Amino acid sequence: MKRTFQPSVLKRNRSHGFRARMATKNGRQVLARRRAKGRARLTVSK
Amino acid sequence: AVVKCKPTSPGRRHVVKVVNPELHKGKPFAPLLEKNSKSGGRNNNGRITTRHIGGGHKQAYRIVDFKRNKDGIPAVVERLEYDPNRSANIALVLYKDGERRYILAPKGLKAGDQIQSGVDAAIKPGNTLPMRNIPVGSTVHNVEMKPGKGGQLARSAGTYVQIVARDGAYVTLRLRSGEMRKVEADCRATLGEVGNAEHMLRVLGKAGAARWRGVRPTVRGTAMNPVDHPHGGGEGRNFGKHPVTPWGVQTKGKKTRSNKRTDKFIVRRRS
Amino acid sequence: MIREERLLKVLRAPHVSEKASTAMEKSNTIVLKVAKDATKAEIKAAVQKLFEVEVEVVNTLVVKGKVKRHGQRIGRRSDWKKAYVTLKEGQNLD
RNA sequence: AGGACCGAACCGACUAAUGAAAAAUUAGCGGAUGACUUGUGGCUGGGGGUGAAAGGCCAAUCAAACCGGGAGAUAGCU
RNA sequence: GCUCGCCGGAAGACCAAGGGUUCCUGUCCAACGUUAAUCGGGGCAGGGUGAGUCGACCCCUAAGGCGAGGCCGAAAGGCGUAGUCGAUGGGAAACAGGUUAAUAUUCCUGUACUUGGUGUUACUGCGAAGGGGGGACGGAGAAGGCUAUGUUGGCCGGGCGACGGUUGUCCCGGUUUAAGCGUGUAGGCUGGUUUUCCAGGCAAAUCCGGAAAAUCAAGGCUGAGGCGUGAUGACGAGGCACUACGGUGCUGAAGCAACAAAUGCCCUGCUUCCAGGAAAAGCCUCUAAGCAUCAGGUAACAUCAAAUCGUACCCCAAACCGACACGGUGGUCAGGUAGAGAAUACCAAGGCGCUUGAGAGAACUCGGGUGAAGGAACUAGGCAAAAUGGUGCCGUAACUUCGGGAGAAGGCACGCUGAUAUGUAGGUGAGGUCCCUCGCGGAUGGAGCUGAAAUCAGUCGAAGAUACCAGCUGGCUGCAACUGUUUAUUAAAAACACAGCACUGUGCAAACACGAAAGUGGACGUAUACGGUGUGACGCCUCCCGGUGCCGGAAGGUUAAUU
């Protein structure tokens, strides 16, 4: 059965990657939030 | 000519083809071509703005000349061509100076016919001259509404317009709709009717044919649930309401012209 | 033209392994560890100057670092650049 | 020629019996040059989308997704 | 190690995606592995991924994204021009053999190619953000020419049979060879060459386009395959020396022909249809500003250059998505016998026996086999089973929209051997002989090879479409015309859609829709069009305006802000 997650690196990066997050305001805020929390992996970026 | 196809299969039974042998069997004039990608009836927001559009065959865009400005040069018709972009047929013409253009093929036009634009041009089919030069009572097509803009009225397969009157700076046209309309007398127009008049006699004959023409199927509002359409819901088949659009506006009669800027040019509305 | 200092900083070490020994003995090819940033021409220049020996050609590759586990803690070894440097016929290297 | 026929791949899912499986199995079943199917990428965002329309689908979640917040909502009830 | 068994259009081989060391070697067996474990995709250590020509990067663009200015917007921001990104598409170049425990079109051996510089001598119009050409394109169908590949014969090597026979019309194996360079064929497309002029190609153009005129019928482009060379080479069945029993080193015959033949190539071709079928660069070409005897261009020759990143391994799976060593997953390769076949059966190459076993041979459950007599009496219901099942030929009703119905129904033949005919009809096609504008040519010729289908005669069986495979059929009737779609995971239908019909709106800055707007779709469309609603092939058809809607009217009544 085709399960929901069907990985694709490029698609992952474009969707969720660092630059994408940077591009828009809301993404930047998300980034800031994650930094505040102390996340080790700020983004999906490997 | 129209051709009723033999019923060797359902979906072929009711088919009627409109076959013109005189069209060009060959690849169109490539210089005048250009790309034309499909919308899916969706705008820049990405939302569907006009339902029932989608798919269909890849099509190129022939660059038709509706402005028709090569004044004084006589042109000769090379061939008639299938345009997927319109109900009419187009004609590839060759001006004496070596330029080629696509034009709406009028009714009587065929290969070898000579045509001409200009004030001086002769009043014969396919020739194009300002409507102050065109005699009253003539049939014309590809009519400009604004001078210099390009023909906008009467471009569809078997349309034409009647010049009923010329009163000073304006002439009054009888549009195919039956609407009588004033138009500036200096606007341009092409003599005769537009060509492919038996276009209406074709019948698709199956669902797939409609799809080929980029038309997605149509769901009736009454078949929906109320949350979707004003007509939705009802146990079994119920329709206890006045007909309306998906957006609640009355459909069977309610007029919707709101343009107060051009009211003056409409002599008489259609009926 | 490569600067001497850069040349000196290129070459990290000789690589000892069975495959390396075989390459040395048969094909007259030395296997070096080099700076990850070091390009082929650079490596060649450095070979020529610092080992005083003619080079035919350099093949390079990047070795990825192994993931290991010290006790409970996971940790990755460094990636590093390997270079097969083929030396001109009759070139004997100390 | 064909939204033509029989029929593998491929797409589906009418009957049947039966956790390896949060929808499968085997035996049969429908379509199989088209309104077909499929890979890669793209676009449409929540009272919004999309919908050959079933209130279907929108990350195992849908008569209004998920995450966080108002928030210790309110609970004549247990 | 020897037997047995399974897959073999896969359960084999190679990739993409995704994973990220799982690869190889040594070592260990606590935990992990549904048991044991000396084994492992487990632990620990070490090793392993070599590129000018493969891919990325790079040049070019699609859908789309971002977007200087700009337009719009309380703010945030939205749209969008110039631009710039964006493959899943276009754009230069490599093949064969050998080698590692583990990489290889990457190492080695041989033989190649590419496109840049730089320098040269030789020549002499070069030059773009611009013009033109090209790239550049659909579906289906039909062949013909080919090859991949396979079969047989020939040849070469080996063999003479654990049991009757087996020196022959016997048995086993092998019989392979690239890119490149030369040739330019089967075939496809097109008339060429020169001269003159011209409101066209945003300017110019010697280019393209268009007009004339002259002259010759061959000119050019394209093109699989074959042939030659590449190759006195490599590889080569197996023989022979050493042996850490893993292998290493030497050596090495023949290496031809015919037939058959793709879904691959010629073919981005041809024929045809309507639903009318990317873009841009690379590439060719034309000039402009320019420069002017310099640069630049093309000409060969020399030299330098090709960086960087990926390259292990799995990849229909125990390594990816599924919590698991548990169904899903795109591409490429496609042997033999039978067969229409990529179905099916048995096999090859190759890969496996699915990580608990041993007994026993109760009930009951599951999955199968057979069954006297009856044959739907079962049951809500013939559910399920059973049955039918192929090719050829004969034959086939109502009704029909004249196409259908129809594989209607129902029947007959079917194996093997011999003869017709020491293998026919056909297909292919060598020598020889003749012609020739000479070649991959044309005629004639028929050797050899291959080879159905039929008829007649015989013959065995209970049975000859013998296994696997492979329609059940007919009669009346509701619904829906039909092919389609649908509740992912209890509903596939009479529901939706449909072609068709009707009403209605909409004159283009269209109606309408998404958008505080700008704008966008509608549509680069224009009433033979587009939108909305209902109905729903085809045939015969299809009173009431009082109510509520809509349309038109505006005499009077009433009536806002305002005053």
UniProtKB/Swiss-Prot annotation, chain A:
Q: Which domain of life is it from?
A: Bacteria
Query: What protein name does the entry list?
Result: Large ribosomal subunit protein bL34
List GO BP terms, alphabetically: translation
Entry keyword set: Ribonucleoprotein, Ribosomal protein
Q: Name one GO cellular component term.
A: ribonucleoprotein complex
PROSITE patterns reported for this sequence = RIBOSOMAL_L34
Q: Coding gene?
A: rpmH
Q: Name one Pfam family in it.
A: Ribosomal_L34
Q: Its family?
A: Belongs to the bacterial ribosomal protein bL34 family.
- InterPro entries in the record, alphabetically? Ribosomal_bL34, Ribosomal_bL34_CS
Q: Name any one GO molecular function.
A: structural constituent of ribosome
Swiss-Prot record, chain B:
A GO CC annotation recorded here is:
cytoplasm
Q: Does the record bear RNA-binding in its keywords?
A: yes
What Pfam families is this protein classified in?
Ribosomal_L2, Ribosomal_L2_C
Query: Span of the secretion signal?
Result: none
Organism domain of life: Bacteria
Q: Does the keyword GTP-binding apply?
A: no
Keyword line: Acetylation, Ribonucleoprotein, Ribosomal protein, RNA-binding, rRNA-binding
Q: Name one GO molecular function term.
A: zinc ion binding
Outcome of mutating residue 229 to Q, per the record?
Answer: Loss of peptidyltransferase activity in reconstituted ribosomes. No change in rRNA binding or assembly into ribosomes
From start to end residue, where is composition biased (Low complexity)? 38-47
Q: Report the InterPro entries cross-referenced here.
A: NA-bd_OB-fold, Rib_uL2_dom2, Ribosomal_uL2, Ribosomal_uL2_bac/org-type, Ribosomal_uL2_C, Ribosomal_uL2_CS, Ribosomal_uL2_dom3, Ribosomal_uL2_RNA-bd_dom
Query: Which positions does the record annotate as the modified residue N6-acetyllysine?
Result: 241
Segments carrying the region annotation (Disordered) are 27-52, 220-271
Single biological process term from Gene Ontology = cytoplasmic translation
The protein's matches in PROSITE patterns, at most eight in alphabetical order, are given as: RIBOSOMAL_L2
What more is known? This protein can be partially replaced in vivo by its H.marismortui (HmaL2) or human (L8, from the 60S cytoplasmic ribosome) homolog.
Q: How does it assemble?
A: Part of the 50S ribosomal subunit. Forms a bridge to the 30S subunit in the 70S ribosome, contacting the 16S rRNA. Interacts weakly with S6 in one of the 3.5 A resolved structures. In pull-down experiments interacts with CedA.
Q: Which family does it belong to?
A: Belongs to the universal ribosomal protein uL2 family.
Stated role:
One of the primary rRNA binding proteins. Located near the base of the L1 stalk, it is probably also mobile. Required for association of the 30S and 50S subunits to form the 70S ribosome, for tRNA binding and peptide bond formation. It has been suggested to have peptidyltransferase activity; this is highly controversial. In the E.coli 70S ribosome in the initiation state it has been modeled to make several contacts with the 16S rRNA (forming bridge B7b, PubMed:12809609); these contacts are broken in the model with bound EF-G.
Q: What is this protein called?
A: Large ribosomal subunit protein uL2
| Organism field | Escherichia coli (strain K12)
In the UniProt record, what gene is named as encoding this protein? Answer: rplB
